Amino acid sequence: SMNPPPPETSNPNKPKRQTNQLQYLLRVVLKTLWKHQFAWPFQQPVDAVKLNLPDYYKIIKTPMDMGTIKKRLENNYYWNAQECIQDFNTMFTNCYIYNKPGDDIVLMAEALEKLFLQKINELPTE
């Protein structure tokens, strides 16, 4: 089996910005989720080879993970906060699509998503 190329974290002809909201997404949102006890399945792209999940990238066609998000934020890849919020939501949705209610990985995603929502609720005005 083979893994796909990971999502890009740099693209020189994509216009970039730093906004106060994107700074909050790195310094508050990403940092809070990244340090959580349940972060570790989400800190890098799913390695379908090592996990023996040959169907993962047959089912998940828009993969996303916090390692990618972290690099995108550190590289100022985004134009706006909504792009980054969408990446987080894609990561969570992929987990719920591939897995089953009650699976450990789903409980982990749910805990991280609760914290994500608590922090996003306090996103500063631009």
Ligand SMILES: Cc1[nH]c(-c2csc(N=C(N)N)n2)c2c1C(=O)CC(C)(C)C2
């Ligand atoms: C988002 C995600 N991550 C991992 C995983 C397993 S082992 C490991 N190791 C790291 N160092 N991240 N990550 C998985 C997953 C799934 O949705 C499906 C699954 C639970 C079968 C396996």
